[PDB]
Design a protein around this ligand. Sequence first.
Ligand SMILES: CCCOC(=O)c1ccc(O)cc1
Ligand SMILES: CCCOC(=O)c1ccc(O)cc1
Lengths: 9, 9, 233, 236
Amino acid sequence: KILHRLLQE
Amino acid sequence: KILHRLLQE
Amino acid sequence: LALSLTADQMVSALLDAEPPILYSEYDPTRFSEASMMGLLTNLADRELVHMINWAKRVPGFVDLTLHDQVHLLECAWLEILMIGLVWRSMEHPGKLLFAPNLLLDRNQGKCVEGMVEIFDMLLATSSRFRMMNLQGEEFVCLKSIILLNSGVYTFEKDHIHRVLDKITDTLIHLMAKAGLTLQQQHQRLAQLLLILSHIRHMSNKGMEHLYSMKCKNVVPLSDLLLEMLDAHR
Amino acid sequence: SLALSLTADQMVSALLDAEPPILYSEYDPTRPFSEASMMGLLTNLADRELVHMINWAKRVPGFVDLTLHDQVHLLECAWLEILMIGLVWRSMEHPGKLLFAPNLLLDRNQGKCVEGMVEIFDMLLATSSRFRMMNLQGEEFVCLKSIILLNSGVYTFEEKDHIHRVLDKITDTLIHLMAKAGLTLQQQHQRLAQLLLILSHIRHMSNKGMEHLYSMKCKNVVPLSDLLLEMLDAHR
Ligand SMILES: CCCOC(=O)c1ccc(O)cc1
Ligand SMILES: CCCOC(=O)c1ccc(O)cc1
């Protein structure tokens, strides 16, 4: 899930 | 409208 | 005379206005998808008639024009049925007390397509009420707030907002009476009003679901119900 | 702690500091609007704002204490509410118009260009009117925006208890702001209620906007970004 990745950047 | 009718009667 | 009411008088007025708890026509020796939705919609229709009488007894409501009364009820009716349901279910963890003879477990929501998701939201609200130890006097205040607030911006307004303030005063009065500190009163008031956002959400989802049952021409809806549904497009 | 250790003044400062920028749209005045091009501007804008929102959320006290799954859940639930409250706030000084971007100020007549959109515009305009009526302050706005983030998905869930403690802190903060502003004790609870009741209307507008966006997607009106598609899909 993209949001999941974006929350870690 | 039925609601109109119940709000009076 | 709504703006002249004391907090105690507002509480008394709202407690006295309360509609009756209706029974389902459910026969405990008989479920199907068509069966269950029919029972729920039949009950909802009968509750709506009593809701109309109740609204007329909410202080300030009949001061409004008939058109504005219609608009508020059209906007809020499902929110009001739902908060009622959540309240009745508060002492029945994991269950929804649609009626004293229709107490449904979470899993029976699956008997109807898309219903369990709605059940889960209602059950979570009931749990929150339980968590907060919501009081009967608070519940009736919240239910009147829904009636007056939900459609108020879809518009009269000044009077409605003054009545809303009086209900806020009444909630705060009840908390002070219960011995809460000022800090605790403000926190609890906020906690209670934030539940109304969740109830709005559930109503919108429930209205979508209902519209879907209405199109899959299977479960018959009363003329009143169809009109209440139609008001939401 | 550390969110629960903040004073009201520190809470306000953190939230004000975390505020995202006002972004520009890709509006091209060389061509007339179509349904597809107007929707394209709003979805492109939403997509760019979402990246800034994600980074804002991480700066809201208490948020990063949650698991990634819970952070995802809250943002999935609240994203459109948060975009809408921001739009309504930007629009306050523009009666009758919605300031989607500094280069994209639209009235309800322009909203008619997209099927089903004017109804949503009308709700947003009524909300902007309400903010003006109430003289909503910037410090109050940022508190409301963080309440939306933390509240909207909280009853779709210890973690929960943590969130409610943070929400209580924001309530204390709103009250502190109003008291510092000279409101009487009674005016304080009345205004707190008026502000929080608006969140019911914001939820409603978000639900209607979500239905509308789903409709645009299902009619192939505009291509949604993968991110937008997933944020929309979270709502079923
Ligand atoms: C019209 C929706 C019927 O199912 C319900 O969600 C329902 C029915 C009766 C109630 O009191 C609350 C909800
Ligand atoms: C997501 C399609 C609708 O877009 C909006 O309603 C919108 C987009 C950007 C904003 O800042 C606020 C609302």
